[PDB]
Structure formats: structure tokens, C-alpha cells
CSV table of C-alpha atoms in Angstrom, one decimal:
chain,number,residue,atom,x,y,z
A,1,UNK,CA,54.5,-9.3,-13.9
A,2,UNK,CA,54.0,-11.9,-11.2
A,3,UNK,CA,57.1,-13.2,-9.5
A,4,UNK,CA,57.4,-16.2,-7.2
A,5,UNK,CA,58.9,-15.7,-3.7
A,6,UNK,CA,62.1,-17.2,-4.8
A,7,UNK,CA,62.3,-15.2,-8.0
A,8,UNK,CA,61.7,-12.0,-6.1
A,9,UNK,CA,64.4,-12.8,-3.7
A,10,UNK,CA,66.9,-13.7,-6.4
A,11,UNK,CA,66.3,-10.3,-8.0
A,12,UNK,CA,66.5,-8.5,-4.6
A,13,UNK,CA,69.9,-10.1,-4.1
A,14,UNK,CA,71.1,-9.1,-7.6
A,15,UNK,CA,69.8,-5.5,-7.2
A,16,UNK,CA,72.1,-5.0,-4.2
A,17,UNK,CA,74.9,-4.6,-6.8
A,18,UNK,CA,73.1,-2.1,-8.9
A,19,UNK,CA,72.9,1.7,-8.8
A,20,UNK,CA,69.7,3.6,-9.5
A,21,UNK,CA,69.2,4.3,-13.3
A,22,UNK,CA,66.3,6.7,-12.8
A,23,UNK,CA,65.8,9.4,-10.3
A,24,UNK,CA,62.7,11.3,-9.5
A,25,UNK,CA,62.6,14.8,-8.1
A,26,UNK,CA,60.0,17.3,-7.0
A,27,UNK,CA,58.0,16.9,-10.2
A,28,UNK,CA,57.3,13.3,-9.5
A,29,UNK,CA,56.3,10.9,-12.3
A,30,UNK,CA,56.3,13.1,-15.3
A,31,UNK,CA,55.9,12.0,-18.9
A,32,UNK,CA,59.7,12.1,-19.2
A,33,UNK,CA,60.4,10.2,-16.1
A,34,UNK,CA,58.0,7.4,-17.2
A,35,UNK,CA,59.8,7.3,-20.5
A,36,UNK,CA,63.1,6.9,-18.6
A,37,UNK,CA,61.6,4.0,-16.6
A,38,UNK,CA,60.3,2.3,-19.7
A,39,UNK,CA,63.7,2.7,-21.4
A,40,UNK,CA,65.4,1.3,-18.3
A,41,UNK,CA,63.1,-1.7,-18.1
A,42,UNK,CA,63.6,-2.4,-21.8
A,43,UNK,CA,67.4,-2.4,-21.6
A,44,UNK,CA,68.0,-3.7,-18.1
A,45,UNK,CA,64.9,-5.7,-17.0
A,46,UNK,CA,65.9,-5.2,-13.3
A,47,UNK,CA,66.1,-1.6,-12.3
A,48,UNK,CA,66.4,0.7,-9.3
A,49,UNK,CA,64.4,3.9,-9.3
A,50,UNK,CA,65.3,6.6,-6.6
A,51,UNK,CA,62.4,8.3,-5.0
A,52,UNK,CA,64.0,10.6,-2.4
A,53,UNK,CA,62.2,13.0,-0.3
A,54,UNK,CA,58.9,11.1,-0.5
A,55,UNK,CA,56.8,10.3,2.4
A,56,UNK,CA,54.9,7.0,2.7
A,57,UNK,CA,51.7,8.1,0.9
A,58,UNK,CA,53.5,10.1,-1.8
A,59,UNK,CA,55.8,7.2,-2.5
A,60,UNK,CA,52.9,4.8,-2.6
A,61,UNK,CA,51.2,7.0,-5.3
A,62,UNK,CA,54.3,6.9,-7.3
A,63,UNK,CA,54.8,3.1,-6.9
A,64,UNK,CA,51.2,2.5,-7.9
A,65,UNK,CA,51.4,4.6,-11.0
A,66,UNK,CA,54.7,3.0,-12.2
A,67,UNK,CA,53.3,-0.5,-11.8
A,68,UNK,CA,50.0,0.4,-13.5
A,69,UNK,CA,51.8,2.0,-16.5
A,70,UNK,CA,54.7,-0.3,-16.9
A,71,UNK,CA,53.4,-3.7,-15.7
A,72,UNK,CA,56.6,-4.2,-13.8
A,73,UNK,CA,56.8,-6.2,-10.7
A,74,UNK,CA,57.8,-4.7,-7.4
A,75,UNK,CA,60.8,-6.5,-6.1
A,76,UNK,CA,61.7,-4.3,-3.1
A,77,UNK,CA,60.7,-1.0,-1.6
A,78,UNK,CA,63.3,0.2,1.0
A,79,UNK,CA,63.7,3.7,2.0
A,80,UNK,CA,64.0,5.9,-1.1
A,81,UNK,CA,64.7,3.1,-3.6
A,82,UNK,CA,62.2,1.1,-5.6
A,83,UNK,CA,63.4,-2.1,-7.2
A,84,UNK,CA,61.4,-3.1,-10.3
A,85,UNK,CA,61.5,-6.0,-12.8
A,86,UNK,CA,59.9,-6.7,-16.1
A,87,UNK,CA,61.0,-9.5,-18.5
A,88,UNK,CA,62.4,-8.8,-21.9
A,89,UNK,CA,61.7,-10.7,-25.2
A,90,UNK,CA,65.5,-11.1,-25.2
A,91,UNK,CA,66.2,-12.1,-21.6
A,92,UNK,CA,69.4,-10.4,-20.3
A,93,UNK,CA,69.1,-11.8,-16.8
A,94,UNK,CA,68.7,-15.5,-16.1
A,95,UNK,CA,65.8,-15.8,-13.7
A,96,UNK,CA,65.4,-18.9,-11.6
A,97,UNK,CA,62.7,-21.4,-12.3
């Protein structure tokens, strides 16, 4: 998913009003966590995934794997939160041109 600068910023602003819908723990990106992320992308398009207690390299492994498997766009990485977006066949969120 390739987002323009303006699209990414639009989604970053919207995600400020969202809570995380997936949380990772010590076991990282398990099969079940990936299914939760897929589910969340499907229903919500724009999601926040909490990745607490991850150092920079660990978090990067996780980000890379999520993007590879899901084809979601990275909207924002700040601290322990990953904001991701993937469009739906039935758009829920109006994305700017």
C-alpha cells in the first residue's frame, strides 16, 4: 500500500483519536497476533498496534514482518505504537485524493 504524503498525514491525524486494537506481548508476532492484525485491517482499514517493551531493532523486525505479510502501509511509528493502513473493498474511511 503506497500512500502520498498528504494521505499519510490525513491518517496520522485521524489515528490520534483511536485506541490500539491489537497488542503484542513477549511472544511477538505469533500466528494468532497476525490473524488479529488481518482481522483489524479488514474491519477498520486504519489501525493502531501496540508493541510495548520493544527496543528499536526488535520493533523494526516486527514492523517489517507485519508489512510483508499484510501489505499494509506504515502511517506512523511513535514509541510503542504502530499505525497501519490498508484499503478495503468497501471503503469505511474516506481517504483524500
